[PDB]
Paper text:
EnvP(b)1 has the characteristics of a classical gammaretroviral envelope protein. When ectopically expressed, human EnvP(b)1 can mediate fusion of cells in culture.
We determined the crystal structure of the human EnvP(b)1 iRBD. Single anomalous dispersion (SAD) from a platinum derivative was used to obtain experimental phases and ultimately produce a model. The iRBD’s core is defined by a β sandwich that shares some similarity with a V-type Ig fold, although it lacks the first β sheet at the N terminus. Extensions between the β sheets form a series of loops and α-helical regions that decorate the core. There is weak sequence identity between these features and the gammaretrovirus variable regions A, B, and C (VRA, VRB, and VRC, respectively), which are believed to dictate Env-receptor interactions for gammaretroviruses. The iRBD shares little (∼20%) sequence identity with these examples, yet it shows extremely strong structural similarities. All three VRs are shorter in EnvP(b)1: VRA and VRB are dramatically shorter, and the VRC, also shorter, adopts a different conformation as it is liberated from constraints by the absence of the paired Cys residues that form a disulfide in FrMLV and FeLV. As a consequence, the potential receptor-interacting interfaces of EnvP(b)1 are quite different from those for FrMLV and FeLV. The β sandwich core, a central helix that runs perpendicular to it, and an 8-amino-acid loop between the last two β sheets are all structurally conserved.
Residue numbers in the entry: 53 to 206
The structure:
């Protein structure tokens, strides 16, 4: 699966990549249809050995971020909704002659410093979907924060 490698920083940090690295969009003609569609992002509680038993963006309650301008109000009782202020999820625009895996630019902006971990960690799996008019295609990916052990680290 796709692993997004994030270098821990003391400042905010934006990340641009193509949604169809994550979402099963299909061939190029299908990706071009998806270019103008909205995307959404769901944090998951699955690990590497349980990926197949926690389906991603399975209900509306798992959606914490969307590429819409109006900001998505997460589910009050979803435990991972607290991650909401740490991430902004936006949609880019692609040229009309866009090429494979380059018609759906999205941006993940980590709004907090990352040298230390957040109380619910950002280092986890995430689901991504495309707001389409048939069954939304849904994929997942791993957000991996780099680590560098300190000198006094035991
Ligand atoms: C995030 O970092 C990991 C490594 O910690 C990347 O995983 C590895 O990515 C490389 C690059 O695509 C994959 O192939 C590589 O090919 C080069 C040929 O120059 C070779 O020198 C490397 O040793 C490696 O074989 C590799 O399959 C993949 N997995 C492993 C275990 O290395 C990952 O790609 C990075 N994420 C992104 C978005 O780049």
């Amino acid at each position: 699966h796709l692993i997004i490698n994030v270098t821990r920083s003391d400042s905010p940090q934006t990340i641009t990549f193509d949604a169809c690295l994550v979402i099963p969009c299909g061939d190029l003609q299908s990706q071009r249809q998806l270019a103008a569609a909205e995307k959404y992002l769901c944090p998951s509680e699955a690990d590497a050995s349980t990926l197949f038993s926690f389906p991603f963006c399975h209900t509306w309650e798992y959606v914490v971020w969307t590429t819409q301008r109006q900001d998505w109000v997460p589910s009050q009782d979803f435990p991972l909704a607290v991650l909401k202020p740490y991430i902004h999820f936006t949609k880019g625009i692609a040229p009309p002659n866009c090429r494979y895996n380059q018609c759906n630019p999205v941006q993940i902006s980590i709004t907090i410093p990352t040298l230390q971990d957040s109380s619910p960690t950002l280092n986890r799996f995430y689901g991504m979907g495309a707001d389409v008019r048939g069954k939304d295609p849904i994929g997942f990916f791993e957000l991996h924060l780099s680590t560098s052990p300190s000198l006094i680290s035991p």
